[PDB]
C-alpha cells in the first residue's frame, strides 16, 4: 500500500503541467444576478436534506418522464422493477450510464447527510460519528454499486483502501489492539471530492442534452462534382449520363492491365480521368498493403476480407510479373556470353569426367512404359481421391484418365506423338494458396498435356536414377527423411579427423544459405543448351517450349519468357539438375570429383575414399536441400589468416563495422549462441565473400542478410546451424562439465565410429518459422463458420497436431515456447466450442466431452497438455432387482509419450535391417523363401517399415524413383494444403501408432460405463452398448447437444441462473436454444402429463385387482389438477386407499429397505403420490431425492395430504430410475416393488418417451 500510494504520488508529480491562462471563473456570481435565484443563510443539515430531496425529485421526474410506471425509486435511491419485464419494456428502460452514476452519487450523498441526521437526534456520540464517516469513504465500493458503472473508479477505491491500511496500524500500537474506530475521515474525503471535480461536468452535459470505403466514396463524389459543376447546363444535361459509363470501364481496364485509349476525347478531361485513376489506384494499393499487414500480425477479420485481399494482391503480383517479363523482353538476356560458355564447358567437363551416357528417347517398346503410365495416372488420381464430388472440368479430366487406363497403348502413342511433334500448348491458369505469411502460386494445366508431362516426369526420374545422374550430396533422396538427413549431418560433423582439436588455432565454419531467386532467374535458352547434353533434342525442345506459354488470371494474359514454370510435372527435374550446375560453380570440379569419386566405384553420402583426400582440402562437408545450401569448413591458422588478409585487401574495415549486421541466432541464450569475437567475424565475412566470388550474379545470387555463419574456435564454445526446420547447437563434452549424465529429451548424444566414446552433444529446437506456420494453421482453423459442426474443427485440429508432432517428435519437448503455444491454442479451440454451445461463459466444463472418441459419440480430441480428471466425475451407477449399486473407477494421456523418438528408431532400424540382411543371406543358401514366421519379431520396426516388403505392388512401387521431391512439389499443383509432405505411406510405411492412445483414453476416462453416464444412454432403454450403431465422420450440433445434455445442463456449469420449462419439470441452467429445440420436439403434446397420468392409472389398476389380500375396501383415484404433474414446490396425493377395519403402518423407510418395524398408530386412510424427475449428472440419486421430497412435503403448511401415513414414489426419466420412501402397510411393499417393475418394463407412455428419445438421438440397434 505504501509503494502504490508512492506510485500515485510520483505519477501526479511527473504528469504535472502549469495551468493555461484564462479569464477568472465565477459561476455563482452570474447565478446571483439572475432574479430567479435568492440568497439566505441556512444550517448545513437542512440544506443537506434539501439537496438530496431535490435530487430524488429530479430522478423521479426523469423516471416518469418516459411514462415508466413499472420502475420504483426507493428513498435510498434504489431503483427496482415492480414486475417481470418484457422485450419492449427492456428497450424503453435503456438509460445511459450517467443516470446510474448520478443515482449512486446521490446515494452516497444521502448516506453522508443522514449520518449527521443520526447524530443530531441524540442517538450516537461524535466519537461514534467520526467512525461512521470513516467507513463510508473507505467502503464506497462495498456500500454502493458505483464501481460497476465506471471502471476507472477502481483507481479511486484502492487508493482510499490503501489510506485505510496505513492509518489503522499507525493507530493500533500501544494499548490499542483491534476493534472499530479511528475517526480520521479527511483522507478519504479529499479523494472523493477530487473525483467529483472531474465527474461533475460530464453529468452536467448529459443532463443538458437530455432535458433539452466511405472516404473513397466521398472523394469520388468530390471529383465528380468538380467535373460536372464546371460544365454549363446544356452539357450538365449530357455528361451526367456520358461520363459514368466509361468511368468504371477505365478502372476495369486499369485493373485488367489493359491500356486505356478512346478516340474523340479531349486532353484535359483525359488528364482528369488519369488523375482519378491514379488517386484511386494509390488508395487501393495502400488499402491492400494495409489489409495484408493487419492480417499478417494475427488480427482477426472476416473471411470475405481475406478472399478479396488475396485477389487484390494476386492482381498486383500479376501486374508485377507482366512488368518483369516485359523488362526481360526489352532488356534482352541478362547473362553474358562468356559466363554461359564457361558454365557450358564446365557441364561438358563434368559429364566427361563422370562418363555419363545421355538419356535416349523410348523407341517403340521399353517394356516398362505401362508401369510408368499407370504410376503417372495414379499420381494424377492421387489428388482427386480426397473428395467424391467434383466439377465438370474435373469430370472431363477423370474421364480422360479412365480412357488412358482402358486403352494404354493409344495413350502411349499420343504421348510419344506429342513429344515428337507438339511444341504449342494451352494456357496455364494461376491461383494463390492463402497462407497468412507467404503467398504461393498453384498452376492449372490442361489434362491432355498433364498426362504427357506426368509420363515424362516418371520416365526422366526413372532414367536419371538408373544412369546415376545425381550425386548423393543433392538432397532430398528417396531413402532419407529430412530428420535422418539432420542426424547423418551431425554424424558427419562428429566423424571428422580431429574436428574438435583447436589447440593450435584451428577453426570450424558452418555456412548455411539460400540461392536467392533460383526459380525466376533460369534462362530458357540456357536451360535448353544445358539440357541437350543429357536427353534427346526433341525431349529438350519439348521441355523448353512448354515454359513459353501464356499464363492467365481471369482478365490478364501474359507470355512467359524468363523463369521456369514450377507447377509442371517434369519441372521437379529442372530444379534438381540445374542446381548440380551450381555444384560445379561453388564446390569446384576437383573437390566434386573427390566427393563423387570414380564412376566405377562411387562414394557414399558424406563419405570418402581415404582420410588424406578427406582432410586435404578445407571444403570438407557439403549438402544442398532444394534451395538451401549447407557447407562446413575446417581451417588451420595460416589458411584462415591468409583468407582474412585476402578479404581485408579489397574490403578493409577501419572501424570494425562488420560486427553490426552479423546474423545471429536469438532463440538461444548468450552463452549458447555465437560470441562475436573480431577474428571469428572477420573469418565469417571472408568465408562468405570467398563463396560469393565463385557465383556469377547474372546466374544466381546469394545474400548475407538471408545467410548464416557459425564459427567455432578457442573463443567460441559451440557450433550452430539451422537446417530442415531444426535449430541445432553442437557442444563438446571435453569443453564442458563432468560425467553427470542427466537424461533429457531433445539431446542427441554423439559418439565416434572408431573409438565409440561420447565426443559431443547435439541440442535440438524448433525454429520460429515452423511455430509461426503452425499458428497460421491454428488461425485458419479458427476461421470456421458458425454453421460448421464441431467434429470438423476437431478433425482439423487433430490433423494439424499430428502434422506438427510426427515431424517434430523429439524437439517439441526441448523447447518451452512451443509447449506454451500448444496449450494456448488448445484453450482457444476449446473456447471456440464453449462459446458455440452457449453465449455465456461457463464456470466449469468437463474434458470428457471433448476427449471422448467418436465411437462413443464424442469428438475424439488429441491431448497436448496437463488436464486432470477431478473426483466425483468417475463414479457411475446401475439399477437391478435388489436396488441401486454405485461403483467408482487421474490425467489424460498425451501424444508425445505415444510416439517413438528419432535416435532410438534409427538404432532399431539399423539393427532390424542388418538382421534382415543376415536372415536373407541364410535364406538364399538354404533354398528358402522368407515368410511371416521369420519376420514377426521385428514387425512395424524400421525406416522404411518392414510392411512394404509384403505389399502386392512390389514390381510397381519399385519403379517409382524421385518421389520425395515430387511429393514436396505437389503444393504447387493442388489448392489444398499438404500435411505430411515429407513422407508417403506406400514407400516408407506408417511411422506411428495411435490405437494405444484410444485404448488408454477409454481406460483413463473411467471405462465405457463411466463415460455413458454423461451421454443420456439410460433413457434409451438399450441393455448393452455393443449391439448398437450410429446413423450415417461427423455428428450434427443438435444431436451432439442432446447427447451431452446430462453433463452440460448442470448447476456447477452455469452458476446461479436456472429456469423451468412450462409443460415439464426440466430445469435449464443458463439458456441453450440448441437443446431447447430438441426438448420441445421430444416432450411435445403434454407428454409429461401423459406419462404421469399413465403411471397413476396403471398403479390404480394395480390396486384395483388383488383387493382382499390387503384388506382394502375402497381404492380412489384423486381429482388430479392438470398443473400437478410439473409443479414441484408442493404436491398432492394421487391414489387413496381406505382400510376395511384397521391397518398397521411402519416408520418411513426406503423401497429397497426391508428392516420394517411397525408402530401402534393405526390409520385407515393411506395415500400414494407419484413424482417424476428429470435429473443431471451431479443430481440423479433418486433415493435421497424421494426421501428429501417426502420430508419436504410431509413437513410443511403448503402441501395438502389427507393422511399422515403414506409413501412418495420418485421416478428419474433421464436415467430411468425409480424408488419409494414413506410408510408401509403389510403386504404392500413387495406388491408395489413388482408393480413398479412391471410399470417401468411395460408402460406404453414411457415407451413413447423412449422411442422419441431414440428418434432424436438417431441411435438404433
Amino acid at each position: 500500500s505504501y509503494q502504490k500510494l508512492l506510485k500515485y504520488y510520483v505519477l501526479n508529480a511527473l504528469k504535472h503541467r502549469p495551468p493555461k491562462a484564462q479569464k477568472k471563473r465565477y459561476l455563482f456570481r452570474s447565478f446571483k444576478a439572475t432574479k430567479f435565484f435568492q440568497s439566505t443563510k441556512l444550517d448545513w443539515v437542512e440544506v443537506g436534506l434539501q439537496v438530496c430531496r431535490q435530487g430524488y425529485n429530479m430522478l423521479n421526474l426523469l423516471i416518469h418522464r418516459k411514462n415508466l410506471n413499472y420502475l420504483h425509486l426507493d428513498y435510498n435511491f434504489n431503483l427496482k422493477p415492480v414486475k417481470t419485464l418484457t422485450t419492449k419494456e427492456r428497450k424503453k428502460s435503456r438509460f445511459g450510464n450517467a443516470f446510474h452514476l448520478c443515482r449512486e452519487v446521490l446515494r452516497l450523498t444521502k448516506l453522508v447527510v443522514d449520518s449527521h441526521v443520526q447524530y443530531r437526534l441524540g442517538n450516537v456520540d461524535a466519537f461514534q460519528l467520526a467512525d461512521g464517516l470513516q467507513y463510508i469513504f473507505a467502503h464506497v465500493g462495498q456500500l454502493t454499486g458505483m464501481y460497476r458503472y465506471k471502471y476507472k473508479l477502481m483507481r479511486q477505491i484502492r487508493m482510499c483502501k490503501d489510506l485505510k491500511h496505513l492509518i489503522y496500524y499507525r493507530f493500533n500500537t500501544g494499548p490499542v489492539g483491534k476493534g472499530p474506530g479511528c475517526g480520521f475521515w479527511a483522507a478519504g474525503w479529499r479523494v472523493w471530492l477530487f473525483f467529483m471535480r472531474g465527474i461533475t461536468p460530464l453529468l452536467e452535459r448529459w443532463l443538458g442534452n437530455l432535458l433539452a470505403s466511405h472516404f473513397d466514396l466521398e472523394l469520388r463524389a468530390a471529383v465528380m462534382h468538380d467535373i460536372l459543376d464546371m460544365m454549363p447546363e446544356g452539357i450538365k444535361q449530357n455528361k451526367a449520363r456520358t461520363i459514368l459509363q466509361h468511368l468504371s470501364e477505365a478502372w476495369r481496364c486499369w485493373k485488367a492491365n489493359i491500356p486505356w485509349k478512346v478516340p474523340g476525347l479531349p486532353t484535359p478531361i483525359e488528364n482528369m480521368i488519369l488523375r482519378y485513376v491514379k488517386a484511386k489506384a494509390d488508395w487501393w494499393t495502400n488499402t491492400a498493403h494495409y489489409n495484408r499487414e493487419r492480417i499478417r500480425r494475427g488480427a482477426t477479420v472476416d473471411k470475405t476480407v481475406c478472399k478479396k485481399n488475396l485477389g487484390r494482391l494476386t492482381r498486383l503480383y500479376l501486374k508485377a510479373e507482366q512488368e518483369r517479363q516485359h523488362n526481360y523482353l526489352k532488356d534482352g538476356p541478362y547473362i553474358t556470353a562468356e559466363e554461359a560458355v564457361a558454365v557450358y564447358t564446365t557441364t561438358v567437363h563434368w559429364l566427361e569426367s563422370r562418363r555419363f551416357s545421355p538419356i535416349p528417347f523410348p523407341p517403340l517398346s521399353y517394356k516398362h512404359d505401362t508401369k510408368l503410365l499407370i504410376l503417372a495416372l495414379e499420381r494424377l488420381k492421387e489428388a482427386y481421391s480426397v473428395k467424391s464430388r467434383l466439377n465438370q472440368s474435373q469430370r472431363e479430366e477423370l474421364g480422360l484418365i479412365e480412357q488412358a487406363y482402358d486403352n494404354p497403348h493409344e495413350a502411349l502413342s499420343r504421348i510419344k506423338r506429342h513429344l515428337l511433334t507438339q511444341r504449342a500448348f494451352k494456357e496455364v491458369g494461376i491461383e494463390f494458396m492463402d497462407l497468412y505469411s507467404h503467398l504461393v502460386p498453384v498452376y492449372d494445366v490442361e489434362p491432355l498435356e498433364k498426362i504427357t508431362d506426368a509420363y515424362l516426369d516418371q520416365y526422366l526420374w526413372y532414367e536419371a536414377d538408373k544412369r546415376r545422374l545425381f550425386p548423393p550430396w543433392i538432397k532430398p533422396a528417396d531413402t532419407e527423411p529430412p530428420p535422418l538427413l539432420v542426424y547423418k549431418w551431425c554424424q558427419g560433423i562428429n566423424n571428422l579427423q580431429d574436428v574438435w582439436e583447436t589447440s593450435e588455432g584451428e577453426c570450424n565454419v558452418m555456412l548455411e544459405s539460400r540461392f536467392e531467386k533460383m526459380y525466376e532467374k533460369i534462362d530458357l535458352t540456357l536451360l535448353n543448351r544445358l539440357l541437350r547434353l543429357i536427353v534427346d533434342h526433341n525431349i529438350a525442345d519439348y521441355m523448353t517450349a512448354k515454359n513459353n506459354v501464356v499464363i492467365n488470371y481471369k482478365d490478364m494474359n501474359h507470355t512467359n519468357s524468363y523463369g521456369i514454370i514450377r507447377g509442371l510435372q517434369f519441372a521437379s527435374f529442372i530444379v534438381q539438375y540445374y542446381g548440380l550446375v551450381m555444384d560445379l560453380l561453388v564446390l569446384g570440379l576437383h573437390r566434386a570429383s573427390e566427393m563423387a569419386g570414380p564412376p566405377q566405384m562411387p562414394n557414399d553420402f558424406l563419405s570418402f575414399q581415404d582420410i588424406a583426400t578427406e582432410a586435404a582440402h578445407p571444403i570438407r562437408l557439403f549438402c544442398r536441400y532444394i534451395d538451401r545450401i549447407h557447407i562446413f569448413f575446417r581451417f588451420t591458422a595460416d589458411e584462415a589468416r591468409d583468407l582474412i588478409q585476402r578479404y581485408l585487401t579489397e574490403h578493409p574495415d577501419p572501424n570494425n563495422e562488420n560486427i553490426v549486421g552479423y546474423n545471429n541466432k536469438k532463440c538461444w541464450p548468450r552463452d549458447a549462441r555465437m560470441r562475436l569475437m573480431k577474428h571469428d567475424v572477420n573469418l565469417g565475412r571472408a568465408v562468405f565473400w570467398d563463396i560469393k566470388n565463385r557465383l556469377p550474379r547474372s546466374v544466381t545470387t546469394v545474400q548475407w542478410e538471408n545467410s548464416f555463419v557459425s564459427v567455432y574456435s578457442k573463443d567460441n564454445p559451440n557450433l550452430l546451424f539451422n537446417m530442415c526446420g531444426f535449430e541445432c547447437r553442437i557442444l563438446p563434452k571435453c569443453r564442458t562439465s563432468y560425467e553427470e549424465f542427466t537424461h533429457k529429451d531433445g539431446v542427441w548424444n554423439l559418439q565416434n565410429e572408431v573409438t565409440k566414446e561420447r565426443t559431443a552433444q547435439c541440442f535440438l529446437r524448433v525454429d520460429d518459422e515452423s511455430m509461426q506456420r503452425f499458428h497460421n494453421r491454428v488461425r485458419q482453423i479458427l476461421m470456421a463458420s458458425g454453421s460448421t459442426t464441431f467434429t470438423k474443427i476437431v478433425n482439423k485440429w487433430n490433423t494439424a497436431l499430428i502434422g506438427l508432432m510426427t515431424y517434430f517428435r523429439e524437439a517439441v519437448v526441448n523447447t518451452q515456447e512451443l509447449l506454451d503455444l500448444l496449450v494456448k491454442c488448445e484453450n482457444k479451440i476449446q473456447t471456440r466450442i464453449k462459446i458455440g454451445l452457449n453465449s455465456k461463459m461457463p464456470s466449469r466444463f468437463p474434458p470428457v466431452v471433448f476427449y471422448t472418441p467418436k465411437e462413443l459419440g464424442g469428438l475424439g480430441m488429441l491431448s497436448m497438455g496437463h488436464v486432470l480428471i477431478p473426483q466425483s466425475d468417475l463414479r457411475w451407477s446401475k439399477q437391478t432387482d435388489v436396488g441401486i449399486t454405485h461403483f467408482r473407477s487421474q490425467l489424460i494421456p498425451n501424444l508425445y509419450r505415444y510416439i517413438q523418438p528419432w535416435e532410438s528408431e534409427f538404432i532399431d532400424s539399423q539393427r532390424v535391417w542388418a538382421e534382415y540382411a543376415l536372415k536373407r543371406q541364410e535364406a538364399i543358401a538354404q533354398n528358402r523363401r522368407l515368410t511371416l514366421e521369420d519376420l514377426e519379431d521385428s514387425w512395424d520396426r524400421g525406416i522404411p517399415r518392414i510392411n512394404t516388403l509384403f505389399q502386392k505392388d512390389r514390381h510397381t512401387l519399385a519403379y517409382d524413383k524421385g518421389w520425395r521431391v515430387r511429393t514436396d512439389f505437389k503444393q504447387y499443383q493442388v489448392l489444398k494444403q499438404n500435411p505430411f509432405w515429407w513422407t508417403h505411406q506406400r514407400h516408407d510405411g506408417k511411422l506411428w501408432n495411435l490405437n494405444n492412445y484410444r485404448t488408454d483414453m477409454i481406460q483413463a476416462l473411467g471405462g465405457v460405463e463411466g463415460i455413458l453416464e454423461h451421454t443420456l444412454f439410460k433413457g434409451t432403454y438399450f441393455p448393452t452398448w455393443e449391439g448398437l450403431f450410429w446413423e450415417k465422420n461427423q455428428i450434427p450440433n443438435r444431436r451432439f447437444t442432446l447427447w451431452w445434455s446430462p453433463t452440460i445442463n448442470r448447476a456447477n456449469v452455469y452458476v446461479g441462473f436456472q429456469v423451468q420449462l412450462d409443460l415439464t419439470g426440466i430445469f435449464m441452467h443458463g439458456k441453450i436454444p440448441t437443446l431447447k429445440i430438441s426438448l420441445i420436439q421430444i416432450f411435445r403434446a403434454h407428454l409429461w402429463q401423459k406419462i404421469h397420468e399413465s403411471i397413476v392409472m396403471d398403479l390404480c389398476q394395480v390396486f384395483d385387482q388383488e383387493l382382499d389380500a390387503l384388506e382394502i375396501e375402497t381404492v380412489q383415484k384423486e381429482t388430479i389438477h392438470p398443473r400437478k404433474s410439473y409443479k414441484m414446490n408442493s404436491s398432492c396425493a394421487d391414489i387413496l386407499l381406505f382400510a376395511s377395519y384397521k391397518w398397521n403402518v411402519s416408520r418411513p423407510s426406503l423401497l429397497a429397505d426391508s428392516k420394517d418395524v411397525m408402530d401402534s398408530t393405526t390409520t385407515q386412510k393411506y395415500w400414494i403420490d407419484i413424482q417424476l424427475r428429470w435429473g443431471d449428472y451431479d443430481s440423479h440419486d433418486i433415493e435421497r431425492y424421494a426421501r428429501a421430497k417426502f420430508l419436504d412435503y410431509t413437513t410443511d403448511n403448503m402441501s395438502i395430504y389427507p393422511s399422515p401415513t403414506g409413501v412418495l414414489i420418485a421416478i428419474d426419466l433421464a436415467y430411468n430410475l425409480h424408488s419409494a420412501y414413506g410408510n408401509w402397510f403389510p403386504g404392500s411393499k413387495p406388491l408395489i416393488q413388482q408393480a413398479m417393475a412391471k410399470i417401468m418394463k411395460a408402460n406404453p407412455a414411457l415407451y413413447v418417451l423412449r422411442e422419441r428419445i431414440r428418434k432424436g438421438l438417431q441411435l438404433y440397434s
Binding site: H743, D745, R809, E810, V813, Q816, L819, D820, V823, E826, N827, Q830, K834, S843, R844, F845, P847, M864, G865, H866, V867, L868, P870, P893, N894, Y896, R897, Y898, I899, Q900, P901, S904, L932, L935, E936, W939, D940, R941, N993, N995, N996, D1000
Partner: peptide, 28 residues
C-alpha cells in the same frame, strides 16, 4: 479444475518419450 488446460513446462520429471508406446502384432 475449471477446464483450463495447463502447460507442460516443468511437469515432466519421471516420464520419458518411449514409455507406454506399444506396437502391433502381424495380422493373420
Amino acid at each position: 479444475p475449471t477446464g483450463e488446460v495447463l502447460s507442460l513446462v516443468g511437469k515432466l520429471e519421471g516420464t520419458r518419450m518411449g514409455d507406454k508406446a506399444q506396437r502391433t502384432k502381424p495380422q493373420m
